[PDB]
Symmetry: D2
Subunit: 270 residues, 4 copies
């Protein structure tokens, strides 16, 4: 029961789609396919699907578009053909990147890329990442590509092992006593419960940044005296922008990031 | 809304000519039709000097009222008052996405009234409504039109230079753009010193709020003491004053077009880490900002109105040294 | 810590001696073994190596008193120097006296000629602190800001913010603070934001109170990508809604006192008439009387 | 122990750079230290001083790329002790002005004419008196003095410029010149994640650029390279012809960094700079924090400066060689 219109629109034949739990009348957001654009172009979808006409979109921040709330690809707006209403929200897949890898890049890589870029990570950064799963594992690779030294905390042995293979410079279950408090230029929390926030706050340096990218609790608290006195910054981050997706696919193209991609959906995988 | 209208079309072979038999386009999905309320008129003269297009309605300073909208237009509705963002960016490239839709490669040759159709007509088809800015209720269409370049352009430069209330700036040339620059810079809280060779421009500069105005900087002004220098003339001599009087780590903005090339002293630029920044027109978001400043009374552009049919008479006048209502 | 035969130190090579002209007095009420952290004076003697100052220079002290040698100080962020914790002027290190030894002259700001020592002293914290926060938030003439709490700091914040060209809305529970806020140039002043103010509409929210309720207003009214600056210290911990912070990309930025360069900036604004701190003068010997008064709730010439 | 006399190379406007065997060795005062020089680099900037009248003062020991070991300290010095290995921050900032306080101690007004080996005494000698020990950076254990010396300028200068340009893993950058500075710039830029294209007029510098990790190296950019396609252009030569290539190939809103000093003046096309919003950013040397960052990159193996050593007495021979562009990479001298 398919669509087919195009006035300022295009038609995308879906080649790969990635797989929500917190969510759980629209087809359900990690999309790569084939058709500023001409038939045969390979493209990936920028989930936040910004309007393109507001101050946020114009802007460089099309991910926080107020007009598109409730109209994100597969989350307000898993199917064989997708009529793309707003072709501005597409990114060209490079020739050497497969549709499967592109699809797996549209969120699992895009999201930590956007946060790392926001934090202004550089080859002198000394960063802490908490949680090395879907997002976290890609965050390791993105961070290393920015030149950073990367320390990973994860409760799960297997995630610690994967983190070592993906290039982390140190991996631990808990930070040992020899790690000085106040020594990391940035802390990225992919878990975001209170305990994990409190470690970011203890181990972030003065003027450093805490990026609570995970969504593990509805509220978090920070110590105010400490945040003020040491000028800590907490920056929210959501998904990514169209330009960020271009950047991600370039990194993936150049071999700097290799996402791990693997419909019994009910039972990252693409 | 009518099916025909009048307007002034430019052709490389025969200049700018009245046509009273022009079509009025129906918007497609994604487009809108603007009823032109005011359209401003030196860049149109440059036309006589051989610059940008071939068979387009001129007029690049445009204010109007949305008359009809296509499908898939959700940001605007009939009756909305809007001003056009001249560079008319594509909206799909990295520059536009971006925050720098003023340097869009895909829109070169497609700017409003300078390659694509503009405001010297009654009804303008806007192919890219993203390139519109809402006119506040207390701002007239005439003043909005006069803001779309004369205020937009210096505002874009001043914002890029990151001027603040601790800035100590030098502006060279207080004419059309320079005078508006004075007002914009004061609204950012800056101290403003103005150099102009013409007595009348110096007088006007005082009236517009400059803190000091001079023909030449006196010997008591220390070299290396201004945080930013904006040069609205841009010949070598005025560049050299910017370079001598800019502070270390300060910025020179050569916003005028008085010479095709300018030289800088390299040892000085390097040692004192001087920055030279190019600036062109402005962005959509800059226009929103400008209209807010105008709305709040912080900037008051100077504008006289006339009927669009009078345009040829005023073109000759400007050529020998104003907005239009269609 | 009490009052008439204290010694006067001779500076070593890299030090200087400051003759105190004015010293300001809330935090004093709240290091071990001279207080007074809002200091203006005149250089009275310099040590052999000192090239940036000479006898007769009028200077104000930047309270955090950074070490000058660490990465934070080198840096541009001398206000968060780890080495100087416990060594701040009048809060761990020695203005409530006639002559102050400045170990570390980099932590001084030249007072402009047309600014009095009294005003300079009242600028060193009451103006410096909100200036530092406003500058960090990158306020501009297009900014639409909310300030909560219009007292000592908040009132100066109003004037600093208006100098940057911002539109300023003030919330305060106390009628008299609302009145002062109106006089100091705020564009709108309220006891509670009326229902007509749209949520998500302010580019920056500065909370000079910083209890939970006041944080929650900042979080409801800050626009996407906007900034919340919890400058007050009204609770030890505050909480934020995560989904909202992430989804709308809100930023919370800590701010502490100010830097040496910020103090140069503040004294320039004061010099140019942009900010006019409110100050009454008295003799330093009167200090104990004014301390009691503020408790049951001014600058001093030694 | 420490001798009371020593040898070194002094510059004077009247008679150029000359060996002297009767130089004093100063005893530090309270806040000072004495550095025994282990390695000192030679820079193309020494040539501008000797042969082009680039005026930095008169009558000082040259050598501005300095690594050594603390030989004695004055009474009040606690941050360093005898035996510490340190490299000098060339601009030798005052520490007390707004620029130094600041984060920009490289453009200190007070220190004009007082830079190590360029107004104040430098490293072409056995023992250097350091008046301001703030302007030192600790050499990590695994970094040799020769490499640290090369790092104080040949690496520091391009690091500072690259950082100022905000190079990232999505940057596509052009570097012109692959000698002392340019070779390091290659490695620094790769550590920031950039794609790097190099131009050099000398075959042996091109060959070295390839070995240092450049993604492309050319004499002249081929036709397949689109104008307006580089996010940043770093010119380590800075003559009009190389500036023009930066200006043709930089993207809109991109940056041109004229780090080299090959002409007294350069010109730009104004219409092009304005229309495409090109930025030209001056960059000088680097800062104390930058040097700590650089030595950490070198220590972590991300940057491996190309350096060959020689005895300080050989300096006049290597000066001639550099003047004729006769070697690649840096040469440093052991006193
Ligand atoms: N901000 C955004 O735009 C955005 C986008 C996508 C996902 N998310 C959120 O990011 C989070 C991570 O998603 P994912 O897909 O990578 O998750 P995932 O399940 O693949 O991985 C979670 C990891 O966290 C580790 N972990 C959990 N609790 C821990 C603890 N207490 N201490 C140390 N390690 C711990 C687990 O061992 C696991 O390795 C989720 O909360 C998700 O809702 C946010
Ligand atoms: N747009 C660009 O901006 C520039 C200015 O635009 P405008 O329309 O505002 O120009 P304008 O002619 O309206 O004003 C120019 C001003 O510059 C002053 N001036 C000219 N040459 C000068 C010099 N050499 N020294 C000091 N003052 C000088 C004039 O007295 C006049 O006030 C133009 O070059 C144009 O290409
Ligand atoms: N960030 C720093 O570096 C720094 C420096 C100095 C002081 N401070 C802190 O800033 C805060 C204020 O200091 P001050 O000198 O301005 O205090 P103040 O007593 O002079 O002013 C406080 C004002 O807040 C108002 N207020 C209190 N609670 C309120 C609420 N719930 N809602 C609305 N208004 C309320 C009061 O009516 C009064 O007008 C203090 O917590 C102080 O410790 C911070
Ligand atoms: N801005 C600063 O702070 C600063 C600091 C140090 C050096 N410099 C300047 O940087 C420049 C480079 O110094 P260096 O020590 O690396 O020089 P070097 O002599 O070690 O190397 C110069 C390189 O440039 C190449 N080259 C020369 N002319 C060329 C041209 N026209 N086109 C392409 N390639 C060319 C040569 O083949 C050689 O490989 C010098 O001018 C020096 O004065 C500037
Ligand atoms: Zn939008
Ligand atoms: Zn997903
Ligand atoms: Zn575009
Ligand atoms: Zn115009
Ligand atoms: Zn410090
Ligand atoms: Zn105080
Ligand atoms: Zn050198
Ligand atoms: Zn050098
Ligand atoms: Zn200095």
């Amino acid at each position: 029961p398919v669509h087919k219109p195009k006035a300022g629109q295009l038609l995308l034949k879906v080649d790969a789609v990635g797989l929500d739990l917190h969510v759980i009348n629209y087809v359900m957001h990690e999309i790569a396919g084939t058709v500023n654009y001409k038939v045969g172009d390979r493209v990936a979808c920028v989930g936040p699907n910004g309007c393109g006409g507001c101050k946020y979109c114009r802007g460089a921040i099309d991910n926080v578009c107020k007009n598109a709330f409730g109209d994100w690809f597969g989350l307000g707006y898993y199917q064989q053909y997708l009529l793309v209403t707003r072709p501005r929200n597409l990114s060209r897949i490079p020739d050497n990147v497969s549709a499967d890898v592109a699809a797996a890049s549209t969120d699992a890589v895009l999201t930590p890329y956007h946060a790392i870029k926001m934090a202004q990570v550089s080859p002198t950064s000394n960063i802490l990442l908490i949680g090395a799963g879907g997002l976290g594992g890609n965050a390791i690779q993105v961070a290393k590509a920015f030149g950073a030294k990367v320390t990973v905390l994860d409760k799960k042995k297997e995630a610690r092992d994967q983190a070592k293979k993906l290039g982390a410079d140190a991996v631990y279950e808990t930070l040992p006593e020899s790690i000085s408090p106040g020594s990391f230029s940035a802390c990225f929390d992919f878990v975001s419960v209170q305990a994990t926030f409190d470690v970011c706050q203890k181990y972030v340096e003065p003027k450093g940044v805490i990026m609570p990218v995970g969504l593990g609790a509805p509220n978090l608290s920070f110590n105010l005296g400490d945040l003020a006195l040491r000028e800590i910054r907490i920056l929210g981050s959501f998904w990514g922008t169209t330009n960020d997706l271009d950047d991600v696919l370039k990194l993936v193209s150049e071999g700097k990031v290799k996402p791990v991609v693997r419909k019994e959906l009910p039972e990252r995988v693409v």
